[PDB]
């Protein structure tokens, strides 16, 4: 039963002791003696070693070594030796350190991604960015859904498209560009525009729908109603001008749905104002939303960490430093998924 120090752990001289690890799992250990001991025991696991083989080379008392071993193990700084049983030349090897760092076997996450099927409903700015992440991360099957054609104004956010692509179907060029990046996956396209609730029946079953299409105004309400009735997982992502939005991620029976937590003259005026609405699109906002959405899809399917947007619609601001989550937990009294 070998263990090996993760390649993603770093330690630093800091404060009265030091830091162990990098990122979300970073620990500040205030006691210098303990921290120095943690370093000494980590060093013993640089090569793949059983507990007792590493202990043999440690110059500290067994009880101190044992405590440090446990610390390292619980945070996945040391990982089973087999979790490093893949070639450095594997195209997905960088994601592997990421999987390892959450205590998962990267070969098993990869196999889950390989066998998954994802629907990209909406192939604009969000769909462009989500689809390449999912494609190059090894999701086995991607189905691109969109009826629109590429324009010159798309080139701002829609990173797969070029000047030369103007006039072609979006789904056509994305497929071309996805397969140029990862030819070991399968990519299909459906030419569909969702005019009515009934149109959603032409969208295929999948592990998850990535929904970024936002026309008409109640498209999401149709998608949610449909997915509740079809028992189909979906995630929403987009933006409200300068705020990046992703979530909720809907899982049948395991999470709340979109609807759970929800003068004629002026009424005419509101409607006209809203009819003329066009979002202040901004690539960085689009990209943040799409990045975090894809992370939640990879985690939903990989199963190695909890998706952020379970039971939540998450907003990330671009002009102030702010995240806010909006409660979208299950309501027993919901008219869509309820009693």
Site for Zn ion in 233-272 (CB under 5 A): 257, 259-260
Residue 50 contacts ligand APC per CB under 6 A = no
* Closer residue to a copy of itself in complex, CB, 65/239: 239
Distance CA 159, CA 156 (A): 7
257 annotated as belonging to a binding site for a ligand: yes
Cis peptide before 248 (omega within 30 of 0): yes
Backbone phi and psi for residue 240, each to the nearest 5 degrees, phi listed first: -115, 95
Q: 310 — alpha (psi -120 to 50), left (phi > 0) or beta?
A: beta
Residue 219 contacts ligand APC per CB under 6 A = yes
Distance CA 144, CA 321 (A): 34
Residue 281 contacts ligand APC per CB under 6 A = yes
260 annotated as belonging to a binding site for a ligand: yes
From the list 96, 134, 129, the residue with the least C-alpha distance to 117 is: 134
324 annotated as belonging to a binding site for a ligand: no
- Output DSSP code: residue 26: -
Among ligand APC, Zn ion, a copy of itself, none, what does residue 58 contact (CB within 5–8 Å per kind)? none
**Cross-strand bridge partners of residue 29:** 18
Distance CA 211, CA 289 (A): 12
Among ligand APC, a copy of itself, Zn ion, none, what does residue 148 contact (CB within 5–8 Å per kind)? ligand APC
Distance CA 67, CA 72 (A): 9
Residues between 242 and 271 with contacts to a copy of itself, criterion CB under 8 A: 242-243, 263, 266, 269-270
Q: Single out the residue of 13, 52, 333, 339 in contact with a copy of itself (rule: CB under 8 A).
A: 13
Residue 274 contacts a copy of itself per CB under 8 A = yes
Among Zn ion, ligand APC, a copy of itself, none, what does residue 147 contact (CB within 5–8 Å per kind)? ligand APC
Spacing of C-alpha 292 from chain mean position: 5
Residue 126 contacts a copy of itself per CB under 8 A = no
In the chain the first and final C-alpha atoms are separated, in Å, by 50
Least Å distance, CB 250 to Zn ion, is 9
In the bound state, the residue with its beta carbon closest to Zn ion is: 334
How big is the site for a copy of itself, counted in residues (CB under 8 A)? 99
Q: Please give the annotated binding residues for Mg(2+), written as ranges.
A: 148
């Amino acid at each position: 039963m070998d263990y090996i120090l993760g390649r993603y752990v770093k330690i630093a001289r800091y404060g009265s002791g030091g830091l162990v690890g990098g990122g979300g799992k970073e620990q500040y250990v205030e006691n210098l003696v303990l921290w120095e001991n943690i370093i000494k025991t980590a060093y013993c696991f640089i090569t793949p070693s059983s507990y007792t083989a590493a202990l043999e080379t440690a110059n500290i008392p067994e009880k101190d070594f044992s405590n440090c071993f446990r610390f390292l193990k619980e945070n996945f700084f040391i990982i089973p030796g087999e979790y490093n049983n893949s070639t450095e030349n594997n195209r997905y090897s960088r994601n592997f350190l990421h999987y390892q760092s959450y205590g998962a076997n990267p070969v098993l996450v990869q196999d889950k991604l390989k066998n998954a099927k994802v629907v990209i409903l909406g192939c604009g700015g969000i769909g462009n960015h989500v689809s390449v992440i999912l494609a190059t991360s090894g999701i086995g099957e991607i189905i691109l859904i969109d009826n629109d054609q590429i324009e010159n104004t798309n080139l701002t956010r829609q990173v797969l498209f070029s000047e030369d692509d103007v006039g072609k179907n979006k789904t056509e060029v994305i497929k071309r560009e996805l397969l140029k990046r990862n030819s070991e996956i399968s990519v299909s396209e459906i030419a569909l525009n969702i005019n009515d609730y009934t149109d959603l029946h032409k969208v295929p079953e999948a592990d998850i729908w990535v929904v970024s299409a936002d026309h008409p105004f109640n498209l999401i309400n149709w998608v949610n109603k449909y997915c509740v009735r079809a028992n189909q997982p979906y995630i929403n992502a987009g933006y409200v001008n300068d705020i990046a939005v992703f979530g909720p991620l809907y899982v049948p029976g395991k999470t709340g749905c979109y609807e759970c937590q929800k003068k004629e003259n002026i009424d005419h005026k509101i409607k006209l104002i809203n009819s003329r609405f066009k979002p202040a699109t901004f690539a960085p906002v689009n990209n943040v939303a799409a990045a975090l959405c894809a992370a939640d899809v990879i985690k939903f399917i990989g199963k190695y960490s909890e998706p952020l947007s379970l039971n939540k619609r998450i907003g990330i601001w671009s002009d102030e430093i702010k995240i806010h989550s909006q409660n979208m937990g299950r309501s027993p009294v919901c008219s869509v998924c309820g009693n």
